[PDB]
């Protein structure tokens, strides 16, 4: 299995039990979930990794995402400088889209709700039933769990 | 995350995203799943780890489980001899129950369908909707995936 963790908060965000693909020129990972009927109707990604639904006002989100982008920029400068300009430019466009469509998404954070961690988006496919979630790829750290005996 | 793999086949059987408890005096792990409606109705454990439904006749199963018990006994003799008698005695009782209730379970094997690997059982809770699966604990190997940076 491969575990995808929030770079900043260390919370596990998802794993490769889901269909995953890169979107937005490598800026984002799209993670397709399943609707669960057993117990309480919900999105398996959210239940499985204990993601917490969150809310905020646009002014709060603007303050948060500016600091988040700074944190990721500093990590990319230190470790992968070739990603700094694509991330800053691509993320700015994604963030403008989010703010223009703000009431149309649900927002989730890792189980431990660290304010400096990543906020992920939940949307549904055009079939109205299939959920999927969007994450900043530069804000994730992979752990490969392949029988490190 | 913690990954539970078939000792013998190496296939991943489940992980600790599910509710897990020990049953039958430590002989078995019980793994509670969720029903999934998105796409094709099924049990998330089965879909997530690509478990394969299997069938057989009682005579085939009797031949298989006798060899499987031998394989696990040999592993316990070599590595955990204090488990040999509890496993052989406890498994014999579980197997008699399975054979007496043979048409009432669904049987699953790991993704790669190794004939020497573990066969897991799928049942439903008394609510008729909540699935759960039963595995021999002595036939599993844990991998702890906890940020081995």
Swiss-Prot record, chains A, B:
The keyword Protein biosynthesis is assigned to this record: no
Signal peptide: none
GO MF, one annotated term: DNA-binding transcription factor binding
Expression by tissue: Found in several healthy and tumoral cells including erythrocytes, hepatocytes, macrophages, platelets, keratinocytes, erythroleukemia cells, gliomas, melanomas, hepatoblastomas, and lymphomas. It cannot be detected in kidney and renal cell carcinoma (RCC). Expressed in placenta and prostate.
The UniProt record lists the keyword Phosphoprotein: yes
This protein's UniProt keywords: Calcium, Cytoplasm, Phosphoprotein
Predominant location category: cytoplasm
Domain TCTP residue range list: 1-145
Entry GO CC: cytoplasm; cytoplasmic microtubule; cytosol; extracellular exosome; extracellular space; multivesicular body; nucleoplasm; nucleus
Pfam family, one: TCTP
InterPro entries given in the database record: Mss4-like_sf (IPR011057), Mss4/transl-control_tumour (IPR011323), TCTP (IPR034737), Translation_control_tumour_CS (IPR018103), Translational_control_tumour_p (IPR018105)
A Gene Ontology BP annotation from the UniProt entry: negative regulation of intrinsic apoptotic signaling pathway in response to DNA damage
Taxonomic superkingdom: Eukaryota
Inducing factors: Down-regulated in response to enterovirus 71 (EV71) infection.
Location of region: Required for reduction of TSC22D1 protein stability: 43-145
Location(s) in or outside the cell: Cytoplasm
Function: Involved in calcium binding and microtubule stabilization. Acts as a negative regulator of TSC22D1-mediated apoptosis, via interaction with and destabilization of TSC22D1 protein.
Family: Belongs to the TCTP family.
Quaternary structure note: Homodimer. Interacts with STEAP3. Interacts with TSC22D1; interaction results in the destabilization of TSC22D1 protein.
PANTHER family: TRANSLATIONALLY CONTROLLED TUMOR PROTEIN-RELATED, TRANSLATIONALLY-CONTROLLED TUMOR PROTEIN
Protein's recorded name: Translationally-controlled tumor protein
Organism expressing this protein natively: Homo sapiens
Gene it is expressed from: TPT1
